Amino acid sequence: IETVPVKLKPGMDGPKVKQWPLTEEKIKALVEICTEMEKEGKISKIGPENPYNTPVFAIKKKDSTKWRKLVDFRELNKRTQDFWEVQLGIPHPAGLKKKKSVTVLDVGDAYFSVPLDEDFRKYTAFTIPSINNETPGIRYQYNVLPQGWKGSPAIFQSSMTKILEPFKKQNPDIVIYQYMDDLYVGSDLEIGQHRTKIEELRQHLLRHPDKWTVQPIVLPEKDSWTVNDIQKLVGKLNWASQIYPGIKVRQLCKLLRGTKALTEVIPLTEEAELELAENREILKEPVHGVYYDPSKDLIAEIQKQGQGQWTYQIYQEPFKNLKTGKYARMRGAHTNDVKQLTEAVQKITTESIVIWGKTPKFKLPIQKETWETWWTEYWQATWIPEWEFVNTPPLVKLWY
Amino acid sequence: PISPIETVPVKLKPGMDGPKVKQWPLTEEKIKALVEICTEMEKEGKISKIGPENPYNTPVFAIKKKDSTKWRKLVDFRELNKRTQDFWEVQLGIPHPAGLKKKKSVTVLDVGDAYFSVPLDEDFRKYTAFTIPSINNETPGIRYQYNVLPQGWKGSPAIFQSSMTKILEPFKKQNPDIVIYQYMDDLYVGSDLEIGQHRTKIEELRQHLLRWGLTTPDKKHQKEPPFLWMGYELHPDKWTVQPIVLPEKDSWTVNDIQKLVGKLNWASQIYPGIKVRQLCKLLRGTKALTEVIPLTEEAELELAENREILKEPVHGVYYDPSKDLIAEIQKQGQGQWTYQIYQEPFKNLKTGKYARMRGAHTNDVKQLTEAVQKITTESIVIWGKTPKFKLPIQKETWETWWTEYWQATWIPEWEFVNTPPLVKLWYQLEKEPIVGAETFYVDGAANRETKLGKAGYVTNKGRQKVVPLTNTTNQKTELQAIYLALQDSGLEVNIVTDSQYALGIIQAQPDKSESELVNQIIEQLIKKEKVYLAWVPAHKGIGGNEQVDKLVSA
RNA sequence: AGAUUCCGUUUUCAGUCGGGAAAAACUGAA
After folding, report:
1. B443 is in an annotated binding site
2. Is the same domain home to A232 and A170?
3. Is there contact between B183 and strand C, defined as CB under 7 Å from any strand atom?
4. Which of B11, B159, B183, B35 lies closest to B100, judged by CA?
5. How changing residue 451 to R affects the protein (chain B)?
6. Do A310 and A251 fall within a single domain?
7. Is residue B280 within 8 Å of residue B220, measured between CB atoms?
8. The domain that contains B383 carries what CATH number?
9. Do the domain assignments include residue B63?
10. Which parts of B301-380 are beta strand (E)?
């Protein structure tokens, strides 16, 4: 077919990312995966004269049988022209948020048909590493819409639309949202009657959000109120005001007035009895200021809660939590924090794809070095969100 | 024997045009020599005469070789390179000898003259022109242009590697048994074969190269078990590296200074730290390549420290791809650790030291982990899998620590080994306030302008200290204050700050620190019997707080 | 009132500190 012309964003050159060291194993894996694609002619060997490079790696999928090539296109994507003329995944459903069950499909393999604009192929250059560097790397260049590219789906937007239209008009009420290589097929039909529709949708292509829930902040249930037990409460409710401007500690601080030993017990008087109960109300009443602005990034923050539990909040502007939650991956033996944090990361971005239709940008509570040496071992996704390493302060306590 | 391989298309950096530089007239002698020389490269096909039209030019140099009427002439390509299409060097690094598996039959063919054999793209040759004035005085000048990868040119290596591989590919699809590793002009050819049949394969291979102009000299490897592939003497069970000699001549010439860098830098992927970085500064102000230019104590001393390291040789075993990898780390001191990756008790691959302290306040538990992760990838690079560890830390000590830590962490093939210096969390804070402990309300402050402040406290009993302070920040006072209350108190103490900074540092259970006060604050912490550090919202009328608040104000 | 965070290398390595809230340092050695 005649290739759709795509071009890098104004005044940005293609990507030039160094490759991370790969295990004598993932390498071998890749090496065969490529030699085939080469035979199928989806890729093609290139030289040292193509100054560009994106890193690749071997993910390994679903119930884990084999191997998958994963190109970390994040850069080429940042440098790729936005898609808005050929409206990339047109309006976001908004229905998805609400359906009894969404299911994601890997429409991705479709991409390998449509030919990629020749004057753009250089920008997908990737290099398979060699052990001990005993060999020049094998370098290639895509010749078709590549798997993780931003350009891909939008370009193939129409082909897809024609493909689903029948089945969509055939079942006027099953929402289908395409995001990257996935197809989020949501419905409210019974589980069995859902699956059929998927299968019907599946032949075509062959040619549970409604349970999600937010975190209601609550103060403890006490009687044994020591001085610091109150000091605690006071501190939190202080910070909590930044979120709910109505909450106020004062009658509480009054209980504390003195120079009392932390262990001293204290009589919770009506002053506070009024305030706690009154505050408890507002901690469950919606911060009317929440707004998902399509033009702002989503930020996700995760805190470690020790019991193989973690807490996260997605927000565009601070204190305006679009959503908050808590993943508790009880890994009695599978306790690789790294593995957990990872699973956290993966489960949070899928939630956001299904809701806001964007993968948040994460602020990981871990050292780059560490996150950098094991992440791949557990990553199971076709995609990879952006991430920034950080050091969590007392939020662990501030909401757990 | 100029190879018939297709040429890699080279460009100049966009916005730039080839070089144009004047050649300082050389001595009658020098000139007569460069000609003498250039004339045969012209004969061999390596270069060629060209008309005085070609705008571009690069300088030539090279003195008496000390053996009859010849000279050693090496060209200044600095400019041409400064305007050349930077290529993509396709390798994570140099190969480590320990990474090599043990083979039965191995030979190392040094492909000779390999550069001059591999042809340069036509449309870039223009740029490689150079002249030969030398004619004493009524000088005009000879004018040549390369036809093959030039010696100093930026492309050379990257283009040569690409060529070398395209050529080996064929012979390789044919001999899957054979293993060819290239690294510059050296072809390590190994194969687990009968010295007879190997000999034959090496014959075959040697001829393939020849059909591509790559001539492999007879002065090869034919006997000696200590093959020198990349300076690694490759004995059948022990690769080694002969200590690198590093001279210090009279005429310390610029290029010499550059090449010197090379040797150092090459060894560096074995030999721990050598970077003559401050000598490198001498290269940050380049001039004629033939000029001599020394440097101060920076220069002089750098070479020495490098030498010390370069003196003691190194070596290890090869990589049995059937025996486990075992890394063993040991806390050989403050902020410096050691480790060894072996497969057979006294037959280790790489040993290593790991000095680091990633934080202003770290923990041994924390640093151990860092050391682990370093070693993990480091293997994944060299061997291709993550080793199994033997670490100076008890399984329960880890388990408590991760649970008591806000960040997520993880070590792989963890296994306890009771070694002498062990790792432990020196202390821990109380989860809940100590009953009957004098509660210290702490706070400090300092005027930004003056950089002076006070630090003190008040208590549930009656004690009430306060202290004058010079040149500090409010963080430093808030810490001073925690310190005081620590000193002026007993084995069990509840303490309380209006500062998340100090709280944080302490919460992290810092073993040591760059911060003396923090160290001070730590020394006490290890001495006390129970500590519970709490935090309260500054400026709220929180009891005791409002009080110490006023005491530190002026 | 004070206090966070991210970035500057982006194939790696050799040599040190500061700004801003999507925004900003090189050479040499591999």
Report:
1. yes
2. no
3. no
4. B183
5. In strain: Isolate PV22
6. no
7. no
8. 3.30.70.270
9. yes
10. 314-316, 326-330, 336-344, 347-355, 361-362
